[PDB]
Scaffold this motif. Structure first.
Motif, PDB file in Angstrom:
ATOM      1  N   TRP A 270       0.798  -1.222   0.000  1.00  8.13           N
ATOM      2  CA  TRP A 270       0.000   0.000   0.000  1.00  8.13           C
ATOM      3  C   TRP A 270       0.838   1.282   0.000  1.00  8.13           C
ATOM      4  O   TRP A 270       0.263   2.373  -0.055  1.00  8.13           O
ATOM      5  CB  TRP A 270      -0.964   0.000   1.203  1.00  8.13           C
ATOM      6  CG  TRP A 270      -2.340  -0.610   0.946  1.00  8.13           C
ATOM      7  CD1 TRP A 270      -2.813  -1.817   1.397  1.00  8.13           C
ATOM      8  CD2 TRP A 270      -3.422  -0.009   0.222  1.00  8.13           C
ATOM      9  NE1 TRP A 270      -4.106  -2.011   0.972  1.00  8.13           N
ATOM     10  CE2 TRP A 270      -4.506  -0.916   0.251  1.00  8.13           C
ATOM     11  CE3 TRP A 270      -3.577   1.202  -0.460  1.00  8.13           C
ATOM     12  CZ2 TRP A 270      -5.722  -0.647  -0.375  1.00  8.13           C
ATOM     13  CZ3 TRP A 270      -4.785   1.465  -1.082  1.00  8.13           C
ATOM     14  CH2 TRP A 270      -5.841   0.545  -1.034  1.00  8.13           C
TER      15      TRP A 270
ATOM     16  N   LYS B 152       0.843   4.534   9.794  1.00  6.27           N
ATOM     17  CA  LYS B 152       0.046   3.413  10.273  1.00  6.27           C
ATOM     18  C   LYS B 152      -0.204   2.405   9.156  1.00  6.27           C
ATOM     19  O   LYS B 152      -0.320   2.757   7.979  1.00  6.27           O
ATOM     20  CB  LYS B 152      -1.287   3.906  10.838  1.00  6.27           C
ATOM     21  CG  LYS B 152      -1.947   2.937  11.808  1.00  6.27           C
ATOM     22  CD  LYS B 152      -1.572   3.240  13.247  1.00  6.27           C
ATOM     23  CE  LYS B 152      -2.552   2.598  14.215  1.00  6.27           C
ATOM     24  NZ  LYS B 152      -2.072   2.671  15.622  1.00  6.27           N
TER      25      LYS B 152
ATOM     26  N   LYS C 149      -2.573  -0.826   7.631  1.00  6.24           N
ATOM     27  CA  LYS C 149      -3.866  -1.489   7.667  1.00  6.24           C
ATOM     28  C   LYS C 149      -3.689  -2.965   8.011  1.00  6.24           C
ATOM     29  O   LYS C 149      -2.618  -3.551   7.826  1.00  6.24           O
ATOM     30  CB  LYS C 149      -4.594  -1.338   6.330  1.00  6.24           C
ATOM     31  CG  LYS C 149      -4.592   0.073   5.767  1.00  6.24           C
ATOM     32  CD  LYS C 149      -5.230   1.052   6.742  1.00  6.24           C
ATOM     33  CE  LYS C 149      -5.645   2.337   6.047  1.00  6.24           C
ATOM     34  NZ  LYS C 149      -6.234   2.074   4.706  1.00  6.24           N
ATOM     35  N   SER C 150      -4.764  -3.563   8.530  1.00  5.76           N
ATOM     36  CA  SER C 150      -4.726  -4.979   8.885  1.00  5.76           C
ATOM     37  C   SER C 150      -4.623  -5.857   7.643  1.00  5.76           C
ATOM     38  O   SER C 150      -4.041  -6.946   7.693  1.00  5.76           O
ATOM     39  CB  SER C 150      -5.963  -5.347   9.704  1.00  5.76           C
ATOM     40  OG  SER C 150      -7.137  -5.272   8.915  1.00  5.76           O
ATOM     41  N   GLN C 151      -5.183  -5.400   6.523  1.00  7.39           N
ATOM     42  CA  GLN C 151      -5.098  -6.135   5.269  1.00  7.39           C
ATOM     43  C   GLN C 151      -3.805  -5.870   4.510  1.00  7.39           C
ATOM     44  O   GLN C 151      -3.567  -6.518   3.484  1.00  7.39           O
ATOM     45  CB  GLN C 151      -6.298  -5.793   4.381  1.00  7.39           C
ATOM     46  CG  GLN C 151      -6.264  -4.387   3.811  1.00  7.39           C
ATOM     47  CD  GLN C 151      -7.002  -3.388   4.679  1.00  7.39           C
ATOM     48  OE1 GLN C 151      -7.269  -3.645   5.853  1.00  7.39           O
ATOM     49  NE2 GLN C 151      -7.332  -2.236   4.106  1.00  7.39           N
ATOM     50  N   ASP C 152      -2.975  -4.940   4.977  1.00  3.11           N
ATOM     51  CA  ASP C 152      -1.694  -4.676   4.339  1.00  3.11           C
ATOM     52  C   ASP C 152      -0.734  -5.842   4.571  1.00  3.11           C
ATOM     53  O   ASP C 152      -0.884  -6.633   5.505  1.00  3.11           O
ATOM     54  CB  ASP C 152      -1.094  -3.371   4.870  1.00  3.11           C
ATOM     55  CG  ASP C 152      -0.158  -2.703   3.874  1.00  3.11           C
ATOM     56  OD1 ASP C 152       0.049  -3.262   2.777  1.00  3.11           O
ATOM     57  OD2 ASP C 152       0.356  -1.606   4.183  1.00  3.11           O
TER      58      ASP C 152
END
Length: 628
Positions: free
Chosen positions: A571, A594, A596-599
Motif C-alpha cells: 500500500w 500506520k 492497515k490490517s489487510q496490508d
RNA sequence: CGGGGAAUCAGGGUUCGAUUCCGGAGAGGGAGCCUGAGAAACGGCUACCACAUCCAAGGAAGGCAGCAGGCGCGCAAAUUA
RNA sequence: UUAAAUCCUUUAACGAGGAUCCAUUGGAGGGCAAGUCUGGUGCCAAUUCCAGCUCCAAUAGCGUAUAUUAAAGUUGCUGCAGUUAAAAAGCUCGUAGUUGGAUCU
RNA sequence: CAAGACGGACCAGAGCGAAAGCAUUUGCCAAGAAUGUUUUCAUUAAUCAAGAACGAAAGUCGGAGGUUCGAAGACGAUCCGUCGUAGUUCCGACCAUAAACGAUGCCGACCGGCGAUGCGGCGGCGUUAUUCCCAUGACCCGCCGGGCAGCUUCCGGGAAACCAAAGUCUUUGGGUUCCGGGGGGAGUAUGGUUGCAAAGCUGAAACUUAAAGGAAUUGACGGAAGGGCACCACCAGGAGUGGAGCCUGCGGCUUAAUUUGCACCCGGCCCGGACACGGACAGGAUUGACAGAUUGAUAGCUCUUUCUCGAUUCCGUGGGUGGUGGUGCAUGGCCGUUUAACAGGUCUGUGAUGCCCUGUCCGGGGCUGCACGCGCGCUACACUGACUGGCUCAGCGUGUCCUACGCCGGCAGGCGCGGGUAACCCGUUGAACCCCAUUCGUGAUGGGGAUCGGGGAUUGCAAUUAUUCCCCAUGAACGAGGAAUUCCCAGUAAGUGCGGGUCAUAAGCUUGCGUUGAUUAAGUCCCUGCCCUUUGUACACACCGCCUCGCU
C-alpha cells in the motif's frame, strides 16, 4: 524584498546569375546520374555477379514448375537432388540471372536463399493472399531482412472474366496489409514472363547492411578432396561468385550451418557462364591469417503436466511480480546467502567487476566497443585489401570441414559462406532486444534452450530475459512477457551490429515455432542481470508507527543477518527492521505511518545473475512447418 | 509564359493561376535549309556540341516536353487495356 | 446499357437478432466540448514511464506536416503609430514632386 | 614690471540667435525679430528626396603662444598627492559627431479662466527730475500685438505619469516631410562612399528565442531610528553571597528506596466475575477446627494429624461479553437564595444514553545518604576586638499552655503552691546591641567554631545513622576572598535582639516588631527590561556583472 521610493534607482537611457544557377544544376545532376548509372551497371552485367532471384510461392495452390517454365535468351539448367536452380543469360536486355526456388516452411532453405538473394519474387493465388505457411515465412523474412521484392499473381486468367477485375480489387486488400504500396503483376503467358523479367532487370535495389559490410558467397559448385576418408575430414573446394566486398584469405570463413573454418587458398578459374560469349592469385601464409580461438587461449502425459505447471507458473509470476515463499526447513541466511538488499534499485551503485565467475575468464572484452566498431567500419569502407574482389567466379580451398556438409549439397540444401570481420570469432556476451510474435503464446522460461538466428549465424543457446530500461541495472524476467520488448543476454560469438534476431522454440514434431524478432543491441559483458526475490509477511500487531510482523522468518538470527534491509508494503509506506521477538520470526518494525490490517509487509533480495554456457553451434534441420 | 480565371470577402484589399479556353514559345543545345499557299517543320533533312544503339571494325542508324510504359528524381501523381 | 461490354436503372431466386451483416478518428482530470476514476513501475506523501475505464466532438470520415489566406487596424488608401513602450533627421536658407486664399449669372 | 588666461558679484521668472551658442568699455561695419502703417507688389506661398551653408567638446595638418588646468608618463602613498607630455589659447585647413532634449517635425484653423513678465504701440488723472518754467526720462492705471514662463479646469484625450496639446480620433480625411513593425544576431559581416588619420554615412542574412517592454496601487517584513519609564536598569556609593566551616534546594553519584511535580523500598496476609465447553462430585464436592510448627511474630488466612458440615460445588481453556467499576448529556422531585430564576446545587429515577478498563492491614528501612556543578542562609576570619563583672533602655504579639514565687542541683533540669479565656497574671514585658571597669596583645593566638570521646537530663510507644540541651577534654579550615552580579535613598541600609504560623521535643523557613543608627544622589538611557511614534532608506533578500580543466 522590494525597495521603496526612497531607494535610488535611475531610469535607464534607451538608445548567382540565372545562367550560372542553371549550370550548377546541370553539374550536380550530371554527378548524381553518373553515380547512379555506375551503381545500376554493376549488378547483373558483365562486370558483376549474376542477379540472384529467389522465387517463393506464398500459397499451396501455386504450381511452381510451370512458373519456372515461364521464367525460362539461353538457360543453363543446373539442378540438385530436389531443387532446380538455373542460370539465364539474355543479351537482348543484357542481363544475367540466377533463378532459385524455395518452398515456405523449409526454414533454413528460405532464410539462406533469401539472405543471398538480390530479388525475392513472391507468387500468389488469385483467391486469397497467402496461407498460414506463407504468412509464417513472410514473418520470418520480414524479421531477417527483405531485399528487393516483386509480387506476382499466377492464376488470374483462369477465372471467368466477369469476376477478374473485381478479384484483383479484392486481392489488393489481401496485399495491402503487409505490402501496402506495391503493384501486382501477372504470370500467365510468355509475354507476361518477358514483362516480369524486364521489371526485375531495371528496378531500384534494396541494400542490406549486414551482407554488404561483409563479403559473402553462394556456392555454385561443391566438391571434396578428403585427406583421410576414415577421418571424414578433408579439404573442401567451393566455387561461386564474390558478392559483398573484397575477399581476403587471411580472414576466417563462416558457413551458416557449420560454423567457422580456416581457408587456405583463393583460386580464379574461368567463368563457366559469362554474359557475352586455372590461374590462381593469392597465398595462405599464417603471418597474418587469423586463428580459430573463440575461447581465451590462455587456460507422454508428464509433458502435458509440465506444460500446465509452466502455465500456472506464468500466471503466478504475472499476478505476483516476484513473490517467493520463505522455506520452512532451510535457513533463510543459507538459501539466500548470496543475496543483498538495496535501498535504491535505480540510483544505488553496484560494481560491474565484483564476483566474476569462471566463464568470464573464457571471453573477450572491449576497452571501447564504439571506437572499435568505427575503426573497423572505416577500414572496411576506405581501405582496399589486396584480395579477390567483387565479380569473379572464384574457388575456395578451405582447410578442414566435416564430410557430411558435402552430402548436404547432394540433397539440395544451399551452401552459403561469408568472410568474418576481425574480432568476430571470439566469444563474448551478446545483449539483444526481442519482442514476441503474436502467432505463438506458449510460455517461455528464461533459462531454457532456444534457437537463435543472429546475423547469418544459427546456434542453440540459453539466454536470460531482462527488462529494457534506461537504468544501469535491469531486473530479471523469468518469463518472456508477450506484450513488451525484453533483452536476451547470451554467450555468443561477437557480431558487430546491425543484425536481425530471430528466436525459435524446438517443438515436439520438429518444427521451429517463431518466438522473437529484433536487433542485436550490443556486445558487452558489463551488463548484469538482477534477480529480485520477494519475501512477504503479515503485520499481525499494528501500533502507532511501530508494528509486529510475523511470517517473514522462522529462526531468530535470520532477522539479524538480514537486519540492514529496509522494508516496503503493497500500500506504499516503507519500514525498517528494528528487532526480532524470538525463536519464531516475529519481529518489530518501525514504520513512517500506520498500517492497515489487510496490508502485507515485503522485502526484496537482489542477486547478480549471469548466463549459462550452453552454446551449441549445431541446429537440426526442421520438418516443413504446418499450422496446428 | 501572359490573359480569361481560382480562394477569402462588410468594404478596400491579399494570395494563387504549370494545368483541358484564347494567344505565345519549344521539341536534348545552337545553327542552316529543302519542299510547299503556309515551316526556319524536328513522328523532314544537313552539320557542330552533349549523350547514345548495332557491327563481320569497312560502316549504318538516333531524338517520348504524343498515348501507354520504364529508370532517375524525389514529400509528391494511374493501364505497355 | 453499349461498337462489344462493365456500372447505374429494372426485375426472378436466396439474403438480418450479439439483425457478429460488430464505425472509425482525434481530444479531455490549467482556459473554448469533455474526469473529485483504476492498475502496474521508480526518487526523496509528492513524484518518471506504461496500460486502461469514463466523458466529449465530427462522422464514412477524422488526424498530422508544410505553405498561404482570414482572424490582423502586426503594412493601416479605407485604417496603425513615433514624450515616458520600436520610432522625429543637430538646425535652419536649400530645386524637382505633393498641396495651394477670396472673386466672373 | 611682464606674460598668457578669464570677464564673477550685478546675472533672473530675463533677453537674443536657425541651431550650436551669446555677459569689460568704446568706436566702426553689415544684418535682425516684434511693433506702427488708409505705403508698394499682387499669389509672388507650405513641405521636403537630390545638391549646398553652419554645427559644443574631444580629434588630425601647418604656424604663433605657452599663465592656469591637464589625458599619458615619472615618482610617493594606498578612490589621493608632487612634477607635468599631447592638449586647453590664437590664426588657417579638415572631421560633422553628443542625453546636439521638450527623450515631443514644420506650416494653418478652432477650442476656458487668472495675473505676472520682455519688447513695441495707444489712452489716462497723479508723484518725481531739491514744488522741475511746456515737452521729455522714471514710476502708476488700463488696453492691443508678437513673445518666454506659470497656476487653475468634469473642454476633451491618455495604459497611466500627465497634456490647453500629447485636444478637436472607430462620430476614424487641412497640407506636407523623415521614420518604427516582437527580443537578439548586430550597427556585426559584406560591398559602396567620405576622410591625412581617428573614424563618419549606408547596412544584411544564416541562425536563435517566448518573450521584450511601459505605467501605477499595495499588505506583512528579521530590523533601523527618535523618545519615555524603572536601583527586579545605570553613575557615585553602603551591605554583601560568591573566599572558609555548618545547613538546605535543583542536577549529578551511590542505594533495595535515597518518593515527588508517606508519595518510595524489602517481606507476610486478605480477597479476585458470570457465559460456553471439557473434567471431578454422594464411593462423596465443599465449610468450620483441638494441638504443634513455619515466621521479625501468630495464624486452619499457611506446614502436619484426621474430627466433623454436607451440593451451599471447584479445576482448565476462550482475543466472546464484562461490572460493588470511572465519566458526560436530556430527564422528575427537594433546600437555601435573589408570577419568575438556579452557571450554588441536592436527592436510588428515567434513555436496551456516548465513551476507557476488567487495593487493605502488619514489621523494618529510607525520606539527600555525597566526588561534584548549579543558589539562597548562619557563624567568624580579630584590637571599631574577645573574656569577666557592674550599670541601664523597648515594641508587635501570644497564652490553658504563658508562667510569678519557694526548695534542690555547678548547669540542662526535678518538686510544691498560686495568677491568667487576658490593657487584670506572666509583665513597671528588668531583651540584645550600647556604656563603664579588668585581663588578653598583632601571635591559625584567651579570634573562630566544626569534627570528635565520656557523662547527665528532658521530649516522646521508639532516640541505633548522634531528636534536643547541659558540662568537661581537642581548636580543622578560615589572613577580607578577579570577574555573574543581589538589594537599597531616611529612622533607610547595616548591626542588634524579641514574637506569630508550622510544633509529644528540635531549630530552620516565612512574616513582623522594637533599639543603636550610617555613606552617596535629587541625576541618566551607557547596559538591561518594559511602553510609545516614525519607517521597510541601513544590513540582509533582490539588480546586474564575474561566474572548473584535461584524448579520440
Amino acid at each position: 524584498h522590494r525597495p521603496g521610493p526612497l531607494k535610488q534607482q535611475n531610469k535607464a537611457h534607451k538608445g548567382l546569375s540565372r545562367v550560372d544557377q542553371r549550370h550548377r544544376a546541370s553539374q550536380l545532376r550530371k554527378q548524381k546520374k553518373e553515380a547512379v548509372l555506375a551503381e545500376k551497371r554493376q549488378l547483373g552485367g558483365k562486370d558483376g555477379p549474376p542477379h540472384q532471384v529467389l522465387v517463393v510461392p506464398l500459397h499451396s495452390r501455386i504450381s511452381l514448375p510451370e512458373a519456372m517454365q515461364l521464367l525460362q535468351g539461353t538457360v543453363h539448367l543446373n539442378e540438385l537432388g530436389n531443387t532446380q536452380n538455373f542460370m539465364l543469360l539474355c543479351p537482348r536486355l543484357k542481363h544475367r540471372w540466377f533463378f532459385t526456388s524455395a518452398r515456405p516452411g523449409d526454414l533454413h532453405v528460405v532464410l539462406d536463399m533469401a539472405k543471398v538473394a538480390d530479388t525475392i519474387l513472391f507468387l500468389l493465388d488469385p483467391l486469397e493472399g497467402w496461407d498460414s505457411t506463407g504468412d509464417y515465412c513472410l514473418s520470418c523474412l520480414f524479421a531477417q531482412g527483405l531485399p528487393t521484392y516483386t509480387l506476382a499473381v499466377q492464376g488470374i486468367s483462369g477465372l471467368p472474366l466477369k469476376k477478374q477485375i473485381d478479384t484483383r480489387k479484392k486481392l489488393s486488400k489481401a496485399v495491402e496489409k503487409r505490402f501496402p504500396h506495391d503493384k501486382l503483376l501477372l504470370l500467365d503467358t510468355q509475354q507476361e514472363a518477358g514483362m516480369l523479367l524486364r521489371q526485375l532487370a531495371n528496378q531500384k535495389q534494396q541494400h542490406l547492411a549486414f551482407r554488404d559490410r561483409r563479403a559473402y558467397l553462394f556456392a555454385h559448385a561443391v566438391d571434396f578432396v578428403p585427406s583421410e576418408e576414415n577421418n571424414l575430414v578433408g579439404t573442401l573446394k567451393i566455387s561461386g561468385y564474390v558478392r559483398g566486398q573484397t575477399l581476403n584469405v587471411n580472414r576466417l570463413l563462416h558457413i551458416v550451418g557449420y560454423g567457422d573454418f580456416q581457408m587456405k587458398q583463393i583460386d580464379a578459374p574461368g567463368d563457366p557462364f559469362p554474359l557475352n560469349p586455372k590461374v590462381l592469385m593469392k597465398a595462405d601464409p599464417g603471418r597474418q591469417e587469423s586463428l580459430q580461438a573463440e575461447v581465451i587461449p590462455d587456460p507422454d502425459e508428464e509433458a502435458e503436466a509440465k506444460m500446465l505447471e509452466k502455465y500456472k507458473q506464468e500466471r503466478l509470476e504475472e499476478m505476483f511480480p516476484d513473490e517467493v515463499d520463505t522455506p520452512r526447513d532451510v535457513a533463510a541466511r543459507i538459501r539466500f546467502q548470496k543475496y543483498r538488499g538495496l535501498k535504491s534499485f535505480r540510483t544505488s551503485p553496484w560494481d560491474p567487476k565484483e564476483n566474476l565467475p569462471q566463464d568470464y575468464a573464457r571471453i573477450f572484452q572491449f576497452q571501447n566497443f564504439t571506437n572499435t566498431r568505427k575503426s573497423i567500419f572505416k577500414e572496411v569502407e576506405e581501405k582496399e585489401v589486396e584480395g579477390a574482389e567483387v565479380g569473379w567466379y572464384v574457388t575456395l580451398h578451405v582447410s578442414e570441414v566435416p564430410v557430411s556438409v558435402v552430402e548436404c549439397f547432394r540433397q539440395g540444401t544451399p551452401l552459403i559462406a561469408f568472410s568474418l570481420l576481425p574480432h568476430e570469432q571470439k566469444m563474448s556476451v551478446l545483449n539483444m532486444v526481442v519482442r514476441r510474435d503474436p502467432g505463438n503464446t506458449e510460455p517461455v522460461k528464461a533459462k531454457e534452450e532456444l534457437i537463435f538466428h543472429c546475423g547469418f549465424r544459427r546456434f542453440r543457446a540459453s539466454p536470460l530475459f531482462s527488462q529494457h530500461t534506461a537504468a544501469d541495472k535491469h531486473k530479471l524476467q523469468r518469463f518472456l512477457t508477450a506484450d513488451m520488448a525484453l533483452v536476451a543476454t547470451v554467450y555468443a560469438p561477437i557480431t558487430f551490429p546491425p543484425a536481425s534476431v530471430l528466436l525459435f522454440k524446438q517443438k515436439s514434431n520438429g518444427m521451429h515455432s517463431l518466438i522473437a524478432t529484433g536487433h542485436l543491441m550490443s556486445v558487452d559483458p558489463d551488463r548484469m542481470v538482477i534477480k529480485r526475490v520477494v519475501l512477504s509477511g503479515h503485520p499481525f500487531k499494528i501500533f502507532t508507527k511501530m508494528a509486529v510482523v510475523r511470517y517473514m522468518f522462522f529462526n531468530r538470527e535470520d532477522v539479524l543477518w538480514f537486519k540492514p534491509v529496509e522494508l516496503r508494503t503493497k500500500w506504499g509506506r516503507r519500514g525498517h527492521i528494528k528487532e526480532p521477538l524470538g525463536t519464531h520470526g516475529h519481529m518489530k518494525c518501525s514504520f513512517d505511518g500506520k498500517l492497515k490490517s489487510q496490508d502485507t509487509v515485503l522485502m526484496n533480495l537482489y542477486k547478480r545473475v549471469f548466463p549459462k554456457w550452453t552454446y551449441d553451434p549445431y541446429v537440426p534441420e526442421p520438418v516443413p512447418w504446418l499450422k496446428s
